[PDB]
Design a protein around this ligand. Structure first.
Ligand SMILES: *[C@@H]1O[C@H](CO)[C@@H](O)[C@H](O)[C@H]1NC(C)=O
Ligand SMILES: *[C@@H]1O[C@H](CO)[C@@H](O)[C@H](O)[C@H]1NC(C)=O
Lengths: 48, 39
């Protein structure tokens, strides 16, 4: 479910937020995302 | 971002030995080794 605040458990990375499509350029080895504040910003869906 | 990491890296301007081939000596392995080859 996108554009709706929902608790997520993506591969054991529990949390809460809003999911959406991204234009980012994740490399094949990439799984996680972050920022200079070292907090998870984007995740790659294991099943899609 | 300018993420700073600490890990086993090959030093910059470090000293590397160049080998030829024409017998396959065994070289020590310690904290990782770096391998390069153009063929
Ligand atoms: C997950 O499994 C289903 C059924 O086996 C399959 O249709 C789907 O493509 C799989 N997803 C990935 C990312 O491989
Ligand atoms: C690599 O070896 C040469 C000759 O043995 C030496 O002069 C040089 O200082 C070495 N490299 C470094 C980075 O010390």
């Amino acid at each position: 479910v996108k554009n709706k605040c929902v608790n997520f458990n993506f591969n054991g990375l529990t949390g809460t937020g809003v999911l959406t499509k991204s234009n980012k350029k994740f490399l094949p080895f990439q799984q996680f995302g972050r920022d200079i504040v070292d907090t998870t910003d984007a995740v790659r869906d294991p099943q899609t | 971002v300018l993420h700073l990491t600490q890990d086993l890296f090959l030093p910059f301007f470090s000293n590397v030995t160049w080998f030829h081939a024409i017998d396959n000596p065994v070289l020590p392995f310690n904290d990782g080794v770096y391998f390069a080859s153009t063929e």
